[PDB]
């Protein structure tokens, strides 16, 4: 995380050089995408699929769509509703949008199939009374 936030500063300051405002379009979104997949995030990654995998990310949160105010972070999270991109401009205004997330994560906000956790939940209960009637 730390050396893709100098990533993202270090080539954010070389395209707006003190400009108040940079256009959407202008804001290296290649730079940012190669260096993670590449280089930051990608360096760990030694398999062709994940390496796939990684880049499927990067080519959908880090484009100029992602300043659109119907951009959508996540898709069919409960096969209704959709995680929506925050429109605010400034830090405060993202950080209230965490605070109000919903709470009821599934790992269809990870693009993953609900059903992946059901056998991993199934067995943290298990494991739960297991815990609790051998400290009992």
């Given at each position: 995380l730390r050396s893709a936030c100098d990533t993202v500063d270090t080539w954010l300051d070389d395209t707006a050089k003190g400009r108040q405002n940079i256009s959407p379009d202008k804001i290296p979104w290649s730079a940012l995408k190669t260096l993670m997949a590449q280089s930051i995030y990608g360096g760990r990654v030694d398999n062709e699929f994940d390496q796939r995998l990684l880049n499927t990310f990067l080519e959908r949160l880090f484009?100029?769509?992602?300043?659109?105010?119907?951009?959508?972070?996540?898709?069919?999270?409960?096969?209704h509703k959709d995680i929506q991109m925050p429109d605010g401009i400034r830090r405060e205004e993202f950080v209230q949008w965490v605070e109000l997330?919903?709470?009821?994560?599934?790992p269809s906000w990870l693009?993953?199939?609900?059903?992946?956790?059901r056998v991993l939940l199934t067995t943290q209960g298990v494991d739960m009374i297991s815990k609790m009637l051998k400290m009992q």
């Amino acid at each position: 995380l730390r050396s893709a936030c100098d990533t993202v500063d270090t080539w954010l300051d070389d395209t707006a050089k003190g400009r108040q405002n940079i256009s959407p379009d202008k804001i290296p979104w290649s730079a940012l995408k190669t260096l993670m997949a590449q280089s930051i995030y990608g360096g760990r990654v030694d398999n062709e699929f994940d390496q796939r995998l990684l880049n499927t990310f990067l080519e959908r949160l880090f484009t100029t769509r992602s300043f659109d105010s119907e951009f959508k972070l996540a898709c069919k999270v409960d096969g209704h509703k959709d995680i929506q991109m925050p429109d605010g401009i400034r830090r405060e205004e993202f950080v209230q949008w965490v605070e109000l997330l919903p709470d009821t994560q599934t790992p269809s906000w990870l693009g993953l199939p609900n059903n992946a956790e059901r056998v991993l939940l199934t067995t943290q209960g298990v494991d739960m009374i297991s815990k609790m009637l051998k400290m009992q």
